[model samples]
Target: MNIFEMLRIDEGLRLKIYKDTEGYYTIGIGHLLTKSPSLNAAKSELDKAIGRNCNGVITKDEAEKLFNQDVAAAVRGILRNAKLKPVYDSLDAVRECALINMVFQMGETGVAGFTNSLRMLQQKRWDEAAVNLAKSRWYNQTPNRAKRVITTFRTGTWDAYKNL
Candidate 1:
């Protein structure tokens, strides 16, 4: 079976949210229920369905379906708020993927906070965008990842940003 199916089997199916051994909430296999990174978009989606006053249960199929749906919606939201149409049109697929992946992690609105960086990209000033992107809290926390994005600006190659 596929890796997802294996995870479903290993984590088991949980139709309803339940407190794990440590007393934190979890649901639908192993989706950890926490509120860290207050703006976490994925958590917001889960909260809509399984927060306080939550009732009923989801079937295994429903859980799987919702997972797919949520990811698609997230990508859509990223694209909507990223304001990266010019970047999308101008850059090669690999460089564009780097931006999309960044939006995926930081959320559309979160990435939009990078004003100078976005402006640099919008102006097609790739090097400036790379430099600006690195001058942020994001890079401190993930220097390696930020470097890959920056290198894409330097050289257009998918392999440069392998992990990112």
Candidate 2:
């Protein structure tokens, strides 16, 4: 239930993709991650970006966007919890982002249920980390997307996930 352990995006959910030179970020999300200048720009930009990128009515057609924002916000709140911050800090940004994306998709309790992957990541065991990552229900559930990311991260060919 931390930002480091939340779902980053759900491709099937149909939110507006803020396709900058970096990567896909949701603009339909009014969460702090989308609202901060560092994240997006203005809160209104999220709304506007949704409308533009989606090429559709965001307020009326994108209930999924709202739901995701709520989920993201709830996860961020959980991240700020003093007890969890230490554990979250153990993860790097890529691992943290991947974890968060999986958690949000799977739920806080559900992601925590990942015994091997979580433990391997916590222990900083890269070989085991990649293996454990592939063992997750999330990985099995979303192989089409996660596999490429897992491949790039595991190989260390691409420093940033922006390319892969």
Candidate 3:
């Protein structure tokens, strides 16, 4: 199994949250749903929106509407892709969205561009995955963002977003 396959969050559903204009977008389905929901509504309103509505699958059309053109297009591009199958096929439902969020933000080609993370996941080396997760430039750019995803990976719990 690969990294995404390990997360087990796929389909048109996710538990991630982001503070964008689209209210709340689900992680796997909501176009990079942030795994870490912030406590500050002023700062993380979108994140909170996702936390409140992170469960269940939505119709592709509905997701398309909610996520809208840009984000939705990016999502469709990733979900409809075929090249990612080999790398992501083994991922369970939990790790799926987290990995997808990475791919969505970085472009599957860019995120999956490297083979090391996949290798670690294939070996079920989670800590290794977390290490690799921090190695990317994305990690540097989105400290709080990456930290949240890493929290889920390490603890195996969504509570990382709780009480905050």
Stretches off by above 4 angstroms in model 1 are 1-33, 36-71, 162-164
User: Alpha carbon lDDT of residue 118, candidate 1?
Assistant: 74
lDDT by residue (62-121, candidate 2, tens digit) is 645565566666458448745334445786655555555554444466656666666666
lDDT of 1 by residue, 41-146 (tens): 4345465764433343556776776555544554566556536555556666556656655664455676778878877776778777787889888788667656
Tell me the lDDT of candidate 1.
0.59
Model 2, global lDDT: 0.50
Model 3 per-residue lDDT at 75: 48
Query: Could you estimate the TM-score for every candidate?
Result: 0.55, 0.51, 0.52
lDDT head-to-head 1 vs 2, winner = 1
List candidate 3 segments past 4 Å from native: 1-83
Q: Which of the predicted structures, 1 or 2, would earn the higher TM-score when compared with the native?
A: 1
lDDT of 3: 0.53
Top candidate by TM-score: 1
Best by lDDT: 1
Residue by residue across 80-112, what tens digits does model 3's lDDT show?
766555545566655554666566556668766
